[PDB]
Design a protein around this ligand. Sequence first.
Ligand code: HEM
Ligand SMILES: CNCc1cc(-c2cc(C)cc(N)n2)cc(C(F)(F)F)c1
Ligand SMILES: C[C@H](O)[C@H](O)[C@H]1CNc2nc(N)[nH]c(=O)c2N1
Ligand SMILES: [Zn+2]
Length: 418
Amino acid sequence: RFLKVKNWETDVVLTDTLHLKSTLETGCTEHICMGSIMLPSQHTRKPEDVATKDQLFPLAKEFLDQYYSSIKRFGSKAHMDRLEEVNKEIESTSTYQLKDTELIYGAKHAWRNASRCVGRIQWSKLQVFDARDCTTAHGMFNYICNHVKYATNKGNLRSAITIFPQRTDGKHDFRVWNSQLIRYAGYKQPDGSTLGDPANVQFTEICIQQGWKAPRGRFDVLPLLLQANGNDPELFQIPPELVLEVPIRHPKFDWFKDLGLKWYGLPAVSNMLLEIGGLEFSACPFSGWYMGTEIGVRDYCDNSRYNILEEVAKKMDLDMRKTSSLWKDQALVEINIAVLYSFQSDKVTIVDHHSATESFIKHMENEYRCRGGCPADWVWIVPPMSGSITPVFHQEMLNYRLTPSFEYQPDPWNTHVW
Ligand code: HEM
Ligand SMILES: CNCc1cc(-c2cc(C)cc(N)n2)cc(C(F)(F)F)c1
Ligand SMILES: C[C@H](O)[C@H](O)[C@H]1CNc2nc(N)[nH]c(=O)c2N1
Ligand SMILES: [Zn+2]
């Protein structure tokens, strides 16, 4: 009931007691482990799972008890009256509203509890933008531009989240239909192949079906498609001066510029759902900075993404006949050297997978010491390249689900009553 986790590189043992406070389920049973299912049935919030008023107060109490425990005023009159006040408000409204202080605590701890995030060492330095007074898609557009400009900070990137009004009935739902705020377009070709980013080919067409005029090229920054209070979503173009991009060059290979690759500086997930004290925030774009491998390995070299191992090994002139020449591996390392070098020489914040995984072990030690545990998903924490030469490969990690949390949710174009 007080489980142990070992680092087999260092023989370090940590003791997890935090998992006891866990409430959500994981998908695994005593007889089957689901730790490699990408979007487990549990990790999703459908708009039908509107917690009724009966369900709402325990969730509200539980969250309020840890918040007041966090500010060392647990059990005081202030806690008791806030407990009573929200109880009364859930009676009256069948929902309730978070204080600004409770919203910042909730948001920071959803990040803190994100077992799949390797960058959590920074969880307490997060800038919370309260957009719960927003009412229109134009207002959403304005909040989001302000978020991008703030978080980008001229390349000195700053973590942030913008929180739009919470779900109520489920049919009046604020949603950012983009999966990230800044993404490159993807166009299918007349010959079947794909221009830009194959991930977004359906989303790119949805923007055109709603009227987007596509420059039909590679790295075309998509428009924001914003839905407000359940209304049909409307297209907006982020001012280009607000979208900071890094041209990718290599510190040895001068032919690397002619590849003509670039990437945006700001990773800003926009499709997920923030859950706090039983309330569901369907639109909550949050941004940080990139770990290099996200761009260099997954974005650039996933078979179904930009898939550039081909041309890079070509220009490196590699033994591309044999599978066992590791030409793929060889081109992958050079590509990721280039991503880091470009961002750093341009003063845009980026972290390499070695520094990031070291910081997460260090972060893990802090959580087990001053919190009693740290939920962690090894399948996601280990970087997609050079796994065992980073310290997180050798670290045992207990995965469990704590609230407040970030959840996945259906893409809005499958649930929307147009
Ligand atoms: C500050 C710098 C940050 C870095 C370097 C970072 C890094 C990462 C990486 C590498 C992943 C794996 C995703 C993938 O490989 O496709 C991830 C996932 C994730 N990040 Fe972080 N992140 C940062 C900040 C944040 C912030 C500010 C939030 C929210 C406020 C956040 C929440 C999440 C969540 C919720 C997931 C995974 C969702 C899931 O499937 O469970 N991260 N992050
Ligand atoms: C390969 N990058 C795609 C991807 C990136 C990120 C992400 C998010 C943040 C705030 C920072 C960062 N550095 N990355 C999060 C996800 C997801 F969807 F898992 F949450 C996916
Ligand atoms: C099948 C598997 O669950 C899926 O490929 C996961 C594995 N681990 C991952 N880890 C990270 N960081 N990001 C991912 O997209 C994935 N994908
Ligand atoms: Zn399991």
